[PDB]
Design a protein around this ligand. Structure first.
Ligand SMILES: Nc1ncnc2c1ncn2[C@@H]1O[C@H](COP(=O)(O)OP(=O)(O)O)[C@@H](O)[C@H]1O
Lengths: 62, 62
């Protein structure tokens, strides 16, 4: 609660690059980082892929 | 309304708390999209209530 997230958003605004945040803490599985194998019934790629998608940018802020 | 928020198992292949966090994010909620549906939907005008018998076993981030 010190402004770290706020200043991250401010940095993205100043640089014009996209800002996206996510909480890895207390997370064990790596699938969401790397999605799934695409063969399991109903699989998506990793959350980083979802960010790359919704951002429409190559150099966003992560 | 959400009940037994404190009782969430948050076990294998689960971790719905993140979604709940994503559900309860003041800003991300406004662009919520599903796995079934990818379009983002506003959630800033919808009121949320949670109920539990204890304030502790509930996730700290939540
Ligand atoms: N130097 C600062 N200038 C402006 N706002 C601040 C400053 N420090 C803290 N805040 C406010 O306090 C809140 C702390 O939340 P947050 O920054 O998300 O926590 P953390 O800093 O741990 O990431 C922010 O919403 C921000 O508005």
């Amino acid at each position: 609660g010190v402004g770290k997230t706020s200043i991250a958003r401010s940095i993205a605004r100043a640089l014009n690059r996209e800002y996206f945040r996510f909480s890895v803490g207390g997370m064990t599985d790596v699938a969401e980082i790397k999605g799934h194998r695409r063969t399991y019934v109903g699989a998506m790629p990793g959350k980083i892929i979802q960010c790359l998608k919704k951002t429409k940018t190559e150099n966003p802020l992560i | 309304l959400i009940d037994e928020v404190d009782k969430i198992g948050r076990g294998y292949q689960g971790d719905p708390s993140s979604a709940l966090l994503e559900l309860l994010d003041p800003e991300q909620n406004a662009n919520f999209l599903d796995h079934y549906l990818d379009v983002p939907v506003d959630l800033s005008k919808v009121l949320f209530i949670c109920t539990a018998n204890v304030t502790d076993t509930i996730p700290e981030p939540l």
